[PDB]
Ligand binder design. Sequence first.
Ligand code: SF4
Ligand code: SF4
Ligand code: FES
Lengths: 46, 375, 261, 107, 169, 88, 90
Amino acid sequence: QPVSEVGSRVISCDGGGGALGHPRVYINLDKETKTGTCGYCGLQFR
Amino acid sequence: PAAHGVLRLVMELSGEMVRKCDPHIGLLHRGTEKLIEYKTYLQALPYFDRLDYVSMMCNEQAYSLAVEKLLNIQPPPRAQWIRVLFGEITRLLNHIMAVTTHALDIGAMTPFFWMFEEREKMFEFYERVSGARMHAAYIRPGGVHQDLPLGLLDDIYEFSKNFSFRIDELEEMLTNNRIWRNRTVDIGVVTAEDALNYGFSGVMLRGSGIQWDLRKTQPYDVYDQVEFDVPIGSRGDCYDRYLCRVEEMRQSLRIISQCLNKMPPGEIKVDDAKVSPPKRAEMKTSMESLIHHFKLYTEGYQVPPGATYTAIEAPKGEFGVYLVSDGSSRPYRCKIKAPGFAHLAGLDKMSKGHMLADVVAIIGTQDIVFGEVDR
Amino acid sequence: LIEVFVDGQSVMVEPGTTVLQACEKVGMQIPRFCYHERLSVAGNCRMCLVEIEKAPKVVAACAMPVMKGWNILTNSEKSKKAREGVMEFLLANHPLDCPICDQGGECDLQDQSMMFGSDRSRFLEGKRAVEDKNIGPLVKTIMTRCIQCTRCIRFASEIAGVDDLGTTGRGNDMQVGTYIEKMFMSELSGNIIDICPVGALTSKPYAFTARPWETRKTESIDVMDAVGSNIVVSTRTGEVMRILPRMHEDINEEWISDKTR
Amino acid sequence: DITTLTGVPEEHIKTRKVRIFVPARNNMQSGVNNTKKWKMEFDTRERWENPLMGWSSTADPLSNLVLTFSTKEDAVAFAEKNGWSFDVEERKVPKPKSKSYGANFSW
Amino acid sequence: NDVVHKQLSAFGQYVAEILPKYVQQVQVSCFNELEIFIHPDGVIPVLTFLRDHTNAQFKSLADLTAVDVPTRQNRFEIVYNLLSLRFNSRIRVKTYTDELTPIESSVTVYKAANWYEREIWDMFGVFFANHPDLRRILTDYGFEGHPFRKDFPLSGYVELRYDDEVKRV
Amino acid sequence: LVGLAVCETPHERLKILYTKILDVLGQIPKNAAYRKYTEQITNEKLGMVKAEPDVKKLEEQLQGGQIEEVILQAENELSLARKMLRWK
Amino acid sequence: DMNEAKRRVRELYRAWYREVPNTVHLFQLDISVKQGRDKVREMFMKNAHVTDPRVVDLLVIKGKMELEETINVWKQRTHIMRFFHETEAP
Ligand code: SF4
Ligand code: SF4
Ligand code: FES
């Protein structure tokens, strides 16, 4: 998958949809040196 | 076939009269109570369906009461209305199965097939709300599991209005059918007091005319708010018990009306998340929700240490749960009263000297189910 | 040695000594986090608040020493509202990680949430979350699940003796992670994996491999050293999973080495 | 002695031992509740692996058995009634300790 | 309800005074369940009166449960539910017993207890005196050791299997 | 009730009931409170017996459905008393 | 006291011993007719060191039920052949 990127900072990943994916979690992006992989989803962020 | 797959009634018959029937239960003692002790409360619940399996809901209701008293907690009213409603559809299930197979034992054959169509239509309901055709682990200690689907109640209505013709036609094949009368009318009478000494329960009492009945006597749910006529028997012969079965069917069919007409909106699980797991939309988006979810399924809820005996009007008789919370999440001991057990104990007194066919019919009036006896 | 009343009954308690230690002496157990004997007392994480028999406001249980015939209602309702009060705050940001967090079987925060915390959520905004701080071959820091019971630093400065790690920043954003990338290696680095209140710090080598309700917990002693410290080996059926220290006054006292771990 | 009354095979009243103790606190926990009250764990025996699926197939009749108690003497006497070999261990309550927030500020 | 708790309380006092050669204590579980204790020798006389009128027309055993507990000077702890009809209410007497002391059977007093004597006998060691016929039920034939002994593995010590060389299970 | 057997003119039999009652319990030492209570209600009920020659309201007076059974209840109390002093 | 109970057990041995050939006959057991007897004697040796007062009479209570079963044809060929452990690996 392509790595999703947002200019903001903290983002919330639910794994797609509401109440059909993993528990809502916020992936921090304090370090631009690395991608923000989701805990359950496995989807990277930056 | 008359031994219900799991009975070994050895008997020292004469020429063709019995001299003493000698029941030997335990042929299906799966060993339940030992198992229950090792499993937490929520994980113990299914065993109860596996008990009096013909009457699968009322057992669950018996348990959920048995815990709620210990847990000191009260279901939201709608849940109580479901709990009584399916308590009653199940009332009809056991009575159908009872009157029917009791007929099949004496060769009527037909009424069977006329009814299991209906009984199948009832399993369409367990199918619809619980997702299982039977053994619907649906009643919960906290109240009830998922809410029932919108499309259901009219569907129950449409059936219930038309069921009565069916039960009636059954009654035309039986109650007047004087062959059937002669086979079961002078057997097997039990003295009204002598019942009480043996602790007969439910219909086996009412057949001998004693007034007692737990729903009227020590009501546990909205039975305060339903009105129905208990049918007392008289002679105590199998025939009276039969008419009690039928009439109680009609009366349950009365209850369904009232429950349909007063079925309040509101929640169904108890609010107390410490006991009732959070709804999925919620547990996935707030911390405490997820945590109580997690612990409710991992360790399970604790119960205050204590002991009790609840009992309710299960279709065969009162169903009785004696259990003792140690305070841990695993109940310490959970003796399960089985109404059938007492009956079958009383059988040999009730059946001395009777013809060998009549002992077969009289096993059936006892309407016993061995899965419940062997617990 | 002063008389003092735990809620009702009199108790001839030792002079001074914290209210917490008093109820510990009667055996009733106050909810706790930051405090830890064999470590040091601290005023953070005010989950130990308890109500004086008369004085209107609650005080930290591990703070005030008992004296002069005090009575203390641990079960007093105001105490209970206090505890719910705090617990909602702790849970206001700890990430929904219970299924994946390796601490999940017995994290003290869960059980404290069950016994005391109000069940409904009523936070309705956005949790803060923070980047990881890599630390060594062993410990798997995750933070975010961090709750600033400083504890681990009080471990480091007062037992490992290393003071490499420490608190940083103020308000929210303050972090118990050490500033600068530098790795923290020490011989007592392993025991923090035990000491860490939650899943914020858990052993990488054992990670994910098992769950607490599963493993059997045999008692024995270490052999890597002749020091002979007591332990609780933990096995998931026919195979060892993880080692933990078993407290014993003459030797290990709740601690364990590291090469042995 | 009630060995004849119990149907237990001689092997397991003989060639194994009970191991009475009051359980240690899980150290990950700060809790104390489960610590108290004697229990009567037996010794472990062999447990291999299922050739299929890798399950931990097991031979011994009674590995998982465990029993709470209120007093140690009652426990020892208990196993004695059973005619059981035993390994009684001491209750090991932590020594009380002095604590002082201000001792941190001596100098 | 306070009311029921009252009536059961006073009634517990009532029986407590009527026959105190043996009522160790008449605790009321707060959710309205009375339950007096009995010295094990005293089983028949109490239960006897328990059918006999004063108000204690508590006919029909609901059950004869046998709670076990490894501790205590005598482990097994027998329990008797009872129901009175006209005053529709339930009580629950109970005793205690040694592994070896033979307490008497209570079949005559409550009438429908014949099956239970056999039950508890085959689910426990405990023996009931003056019982016409204790024998195994809820088991196999041999089997031996009582289950529900609170010890004793659920997996038991045995298994059946059919074996062709001998052509038999 | 099926076992229950109709018994006309209860009253006589009743008088034999309460008299056999008071007599068989008449051996009770004042000690135990059993004699106290059981006589207490007994004499009250019996007082109603003399008080109520009619049956139709009589069983509205004993507060027990079908006095015809409760005579056998008292019959149970008779053997009860037969046991009371064997129990001493 | 002991001895009063030992006579009980001897009575029990008489009953078992005499009954055994009937057991082999009626059950169609092909065990050597002697072997059952010997095995009986052995089972009688199994508790041949019990010394408590009440425990031994309790032992003959549990001893009655078995002959009680074989005489009533309760149990079966399987159930009574069970004692010989014949399928076990040495
Ligand atoms: S460990 Fe941290 S995350 Fe896992 S459950 Fe306990 S608190 Fe929630
Ligand atoms: S490090 Fe361990 S102790 Fe220090 S804050 Fe993070 S979690 Fe609490
Ligand atoms: S320990 Fe008392 S404040 Fe945290």
